[PDB]
Symmetry: D2
Subunit: 461 residues, 4 copies
Amino acid sequence: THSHGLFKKLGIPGPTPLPFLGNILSYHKGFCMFDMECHKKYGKVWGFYDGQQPVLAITDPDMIKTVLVKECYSVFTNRRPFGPVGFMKSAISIAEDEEWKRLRSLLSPTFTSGKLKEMVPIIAQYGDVLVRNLRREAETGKPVTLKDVFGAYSMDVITSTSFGVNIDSLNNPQDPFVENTKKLLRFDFLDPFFLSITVFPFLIPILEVLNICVFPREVTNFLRKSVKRMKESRLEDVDFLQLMIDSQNSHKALSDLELVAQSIIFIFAGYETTSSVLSFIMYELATHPDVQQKLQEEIDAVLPNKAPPTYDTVLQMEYLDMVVNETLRLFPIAMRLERVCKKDVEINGMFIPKGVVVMIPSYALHRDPKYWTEPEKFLPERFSKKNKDNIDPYIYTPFGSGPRNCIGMRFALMNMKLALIRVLQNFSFKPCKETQIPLKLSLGGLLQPEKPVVLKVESRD
Amino acid sequence: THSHGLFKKLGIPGPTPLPFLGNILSYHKGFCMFDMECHKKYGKVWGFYDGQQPVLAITDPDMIKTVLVKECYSVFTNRRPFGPVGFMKSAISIAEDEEWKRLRSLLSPTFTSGKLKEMVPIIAQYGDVLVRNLRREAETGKPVTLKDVFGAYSMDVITSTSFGVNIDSLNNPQDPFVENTKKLLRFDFLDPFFLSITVFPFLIPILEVLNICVFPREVTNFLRKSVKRMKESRLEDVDFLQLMIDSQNSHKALSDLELVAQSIIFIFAGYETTSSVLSFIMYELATHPDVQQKLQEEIDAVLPNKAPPTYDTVLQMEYLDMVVNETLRLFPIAMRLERVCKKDVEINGMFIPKGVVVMIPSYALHRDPKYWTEPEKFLPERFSKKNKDNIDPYIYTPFGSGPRNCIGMRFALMNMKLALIRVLQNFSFKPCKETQIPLKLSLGGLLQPEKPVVLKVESRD
Amino acid sequence: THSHGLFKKLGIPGPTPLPFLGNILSYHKGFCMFDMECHKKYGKVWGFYDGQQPVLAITDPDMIKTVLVKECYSVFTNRRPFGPVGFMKSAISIAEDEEWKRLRSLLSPTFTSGKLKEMVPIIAQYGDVLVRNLRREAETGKPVTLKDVFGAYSMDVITSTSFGVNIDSLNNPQDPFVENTKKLLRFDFLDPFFLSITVFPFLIPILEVLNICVFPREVTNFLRKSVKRMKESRLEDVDFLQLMIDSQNSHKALSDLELVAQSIIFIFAGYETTSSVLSFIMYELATHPDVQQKLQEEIDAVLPNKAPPTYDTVLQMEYLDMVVNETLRLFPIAMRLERVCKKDVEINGMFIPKGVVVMIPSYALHRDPKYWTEPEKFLPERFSKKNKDNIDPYIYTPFGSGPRNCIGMRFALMNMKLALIRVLQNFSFKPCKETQIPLKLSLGGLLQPEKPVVLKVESRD
Amino acid sequence: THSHGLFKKLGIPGPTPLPFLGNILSYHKGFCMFDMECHKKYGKVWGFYDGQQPVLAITDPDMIKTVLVKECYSVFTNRRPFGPVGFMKSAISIAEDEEWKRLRSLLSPTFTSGKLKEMVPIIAQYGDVLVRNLRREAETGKPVTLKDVFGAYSMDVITSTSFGVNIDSLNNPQDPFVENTKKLLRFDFLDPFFLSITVFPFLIPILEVLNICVFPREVTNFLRKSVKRMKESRLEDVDFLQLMIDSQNSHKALSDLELVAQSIIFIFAGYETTSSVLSFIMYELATHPDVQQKLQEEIDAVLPNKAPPTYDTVLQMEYLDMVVNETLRLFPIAMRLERVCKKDVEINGMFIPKGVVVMIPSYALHRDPKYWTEPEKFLPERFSKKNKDNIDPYIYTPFGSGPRNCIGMRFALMNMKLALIRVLQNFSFKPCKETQIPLKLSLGGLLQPEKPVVLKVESRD
Ligand code: HEM
Ligand code: HEM
Ligand code: HEM
Ligand code: HEM
């Protein structure tokens, strides 16, 4: 099969591809293990095939800068398609070129510090809810599963910061607004379906004309009307929906379908991510009680008498920022960043022909011995205000970099910190016998634990 | 396009087909209206195209007999495929030829009168549940939606008669066993997806190798393990599951996957059907209060003092059998029966080449003036023990006929009658202003009401 | 189906589309008849659907100018895809965007007046061959079929002006170089296959990965090696091949596969076109003997004593230019021009959303009563140096207009005129009884005669 | 992927399959080498996957008998599909079940000894033509390529024994009837296209509805009308066409399209096969001059004075029968026989589930040391009337066995022997320096030589 000669011709190393399958059989241990092995075997750049799709992996920090910043608009502007999307075509994370650029413009003022400081009282109320829910699991000394308790917390923060709907998801697990939203899970890009998509990407057109979508047709049909109800109950009679409604009052405003799609993508974006990361952080705190104590002391110092957190007092807390960042290092939940090269180019001395997918293997670089000492260890001091200067922003990329980076970065860090502050103000977290130490990562296509994290939760009362 | 000449060549009338689409655009008013129009325009036989699939419609009672009985095993043994089925390939209603014949054998003793008489105490307990639920909607004079109250009743009867699980679905609408099972709805064979299947049936192979199934992969993955739990909690420590478990203790026994598929098909089969028919019957009773009174008097006569119904006392009630049958006449929820002609044949003097789909248009014949006087009226006397002899069993076919007829006929009639007896022992049913008189049928691909049936429910107390 | 609402929403008239088929059933009489009917029914602009592909037809000369010239590079740069192309992707007529722009640059100097004046002695020798072949059919008074005699002439001119190979195709109809090249016929975009492509354009990806090509794999595999033989017999030891070989000695030179593709596209481009047009011209001359006499007199005046034609004496002949142009008016063999709108735009006051195919219906405009008197008549005087000023270059477009017009315009007119001069110097052409007067055009997807043109050929000796 | 567990579950050995590809990458050396390796590694039975299609290979002579004879009608009646066939669906070699059984009936009397004895004078005349053509290549001592000279001979015999058309193909290589027929070449079931068919057999439906056929649409459209011309020039005013025309004067007669398809399949069947085998025989004779001398002496003894061969004198020649048979042993051009198991069965003690493809690896068994001494050597004595009794007819299967064996066996052997007799009566055949000794077989999907056979041909004058 062809085009399997491309990397050989350019003199670029990589595992030899099978006809039709390319290298996918080498995903049997997951993107992370494949990426490290490749980084190790082949060095600073390499190439492989997702079916017939050539993928060029790069690790030089200069050349990563060019791809994510300098030549973003001109050359490296879109991600690769992945499956049938339906109307979700209009979602900023999926849209391309000038539609993207216009969307990214219309939504930027929504993620500003000013709007985010306005949303904090809402995210705070549900840290309280979280606490009372944790307390009920802690007065009845039963091991807690974090994904479920943080899931319900994440869910809570979303439903409020995007539509004003206010639910106790953990206690109302069967509210229609909680039921649909809980189906918006991260895509397993190595499950039968998406593997098939990589071998038969000519099948994508087929599904499209059949209205078959990787965003389940019914979750989308539920919110599309849920939004047009809210839209016309507020109109006329502080959340993301309002901020978008206010905006459609670049250019060309925001279409009504265009608004529904962004609403959906934020839910999708903020739900399993926030839930997952918080779990990873509580695992590390529970297996490193010194770090947990140190941070608890920091929180009490800024917030004595279990004082509530604020926007300014959150940004005050340096050790908490160190804990969060180091966790995202060990578990960057995206694992890779990816851009489609839209033209023949040469950058930092290397020819890149049109159509290749440039890939940055985040997981692998966050654990590269050549930039991190004992990269497997949990050492928050790597981010102390002393050492935070020796860290290359193109090697540590948990939100990506450049114009197409994670637009929800600020919000996500602030959301996760408000949960951590409130939770640690009230509770300590200890390993159980049934806790999996050391945590093994899932050999699938998601960064998540093989086994869900379970811990003992104790009242500081 | 070809083969669009087939009917023209055989001298068979029918609407002229468009290339690729055949006649599907003539489904814009539904199978029922198309069938009547065709019966009227073209007479006793006609032909049309579901894409490229030729479909030969027949209405002579002799020739229907040949197709459903005399030449079933030899010629007319399977239905037509309809979409990707996954493992549900093994479900009796879908299986073909000797696999079907063997399955139909292994499950026949499960639907016998003897087993059915044993299941009646279980179906009865949930008529009681139904009552208390109706009473709560009747002491608070709010119009009741029948599909929801009978749905929860149907659901209840199924969960018990197939797995022993005992739930108040109406009050536990969010039990995991109620949540999955409520997704097993009747297929809308004119929704975008299935229309596309008829135009692109070459797409079926494509979806199959992609594990894409019209039976949602997650409902099936939930019950497959739900069964292997029950299976191994009873083994070792009266429902359909047991009767199948006892059977795998023709020939070749029942595979473990083969058992899970039948379990699923019965749920699918008994849930929206029972729920739908009961609604149609209560609509007719409410718009014909004489008939409702007459039947109430019959029930009190057999069952004085609201005596509970039994298997024998149900079969006693002739006017109730007349009401149920007449309703199935006006609304035969399958609408058509269909067999694939597997060979060149000639029956009753007409050549039928291999591959055609012989179709019997049940809806249309149940309302044919040539066999029924005032076919639009609700006249239960057409089935009185006096006139029940002048009714051609190949014209009145609400469960089909012959070896491949509805294996659940007995159970379904008995289930629906036990619900009707208990409900009418306690309540009368009257039209609301918001009730749709006269009921309009859905122009889709299901026999169901355009608008859901709503009635006033009053206590005979 | 969707997107069938687009034109309705924009307030644009057009025939109402069927689901999936759009308007293709309205091609049952050909693009030409559909275009006129539409122009007539709907006016100055209209819209229709090639399946799901929206096609916007326009006839205002200002707005045509914008599309073909002013906004060519920025907005209207590519044609629409049509089927699986294989490596022919690299052919200038098919390539897109900057690949096109670079190719069109590398081949422009090949079609200059200077190169074309150099090629004339070669094209002339085969007008002689043509004559002797015609004379053999004229001394034996048998009606001649023009496509066959002009086909062999066209073939001859190509094989020489592109590779130096010198064959009498008419007398060597079974030379391997004549056999393959004669398979490069114009695509019937309404034959079963291409119709299917319009209804299932999602099938194009499928064929591509199967190396299935609308350019037969074996004709292309024959010339690809035929070229690499010639290439390496001239290297080292006046045709298009040389001019390209000299060029690969914008930028990025011409790839070796890139050269083979252009070679092929010129053959394809020059063979049935030149052959077809010459036939149309000889039909009109034979049914308008005054015009034929007048031109014969002109040729004798410039070229007395049957003097051979030259580059300068060809451009001298004004009545011949009038005859050729008027014929291309009545039969513009492309029928339409087409550009893909690559962005949301507004031109001359009309919104055009991304993805639509702007179409200019050349055939229909060449016969529009609003710009031509008696448009069905053959009146060469419409192009006399007197009236040639009142003709809008955006209404008379037989080679298209703007940067993406027919790069072979000069060559094609010069090739056809040299054939006409030599042929008329020696012969007159008269209708037979078996000649089809009036010529009916083919209801297919090609501009060609229903029945092939047959004429009586007489020696001016 | 699934169903890749089937052979593992049944305890059947075989090479471990890759997802989607099964074992096709093990065809990189051809069916023959794979089959031997497997026979060697795994023994008497084994299993592998052509994509997802399970293929069960068997070598026990009893169990082969069951599959090809005893359970042919009931269980093992069809071959496997292979690609899109169009109307060629009706060709006996491709048709299935009762259509096959009826076709095989209607054509059996055409291949009888009596008809075959009637066709011999026609096949003889073209042995003469063959000779004069060979003599022209032998008086001009140039090495002859056998495929071309025997191709033209084969072609000649076909065109006459199927339609009465009489051509010297070698000297008329560009007659329209010779041009089309020469495109009917053996399918390379490992060329890109057919490999793709095995990985994407769900693509077969797609091509079918696109009228795309592995029998080129134009060769079939040429003969379909070529036949309806001959058909209606003989009607009314000794070949296969006549014998079929006489037959349509089981049951249901032969359709007109059904007749055209058989005509085509015989051409396809008799052209490259006869041409190929004759080449293999002349290679062995030329590298074993003793055998060549011995046979020449036999021919002179039966046919002194270069007497012409007859039907009876051909069957007389035992050493010639030995030479032909031994060659078919070393090169059985089908390589394998194959039947689709249409039901769950057990034969000779082994469970075979429905859908598997039972395969008999002819090539491998013809060279199995366990039944043949020095199986690589060319020893015609293995078939002497002495040893011809120790040869298992289910191990030596160059025409298959049972009801679905090669219907053209008699004709093919007789055709090849008449060519050999005439050729050897007049010429001896010697190796050239450019002859490939030892002949290497093609690693493709055809049994043919890597390099075409070239020999020195000398006049016995
Ligand atoms: C711990 C939480 C999160 C992490 C680790 C994370 C990580 C990422 C990464 C790596 C990217 C790709 C950046 C690139 O390509 O350079 C991304 C993109 C994106 N993120 Fe997040 N993200 C998080 C939370 C969120 C949240 C809460 C939102 C809610 C609005 C969000 C919205 C988006 C969007 C819309 C994009 C695509 C932006 C574009 O293409 O212009 N993310 N995220
Ligand atoms: C009011 C209720 C029902 C109606 C009107 C109904 C109607 C029908 C009809 C018309 C058929 C096709 C018969 C034919 O092709 O001749 C059928 C088949 C079938 N029914 Fe029902 N049905 C009902 C309830 C049920 C229930 C409760 C079950 C539960 C077991 C069931 C199981 C089946 C099965 C398995 C088949 C396919 C049988 C075969 O192919 O052998 N049905 N039904
Ligand atoms: C009577 C003869 C011919 C006629 C009427 C004709 C007509 C046309 C037309 C209408 C176009 C499209 C122009 C547009 O889109 O604006 C075209 C394009 C083209 N023609 Fe011709 N043509 C003729 C002969 C030839 C010949 C002999 C060649 C040989 C080189 C040729 C090469 C091309 C090419 C390469 C294109 C595509 C150019 C591009 O996309 O940049 N044509 N022709
Ligand atoms: C040296 C020449 C030939 C060889 C080695 C050969 C070999 C074979 C083989 C192995 C089969 C499959 C048998 C089986 O599945 O058991 C076959 C089938 C067949 N052969 Fe030949 N063959 C030859 C020549 C011919 C010729 C000249 C014809 C002309 C009529 C022909 C017509 C057929 C047909 C129609 C079938 C399929 C029969 C059926 O499925 O009923 N073959 N051949």
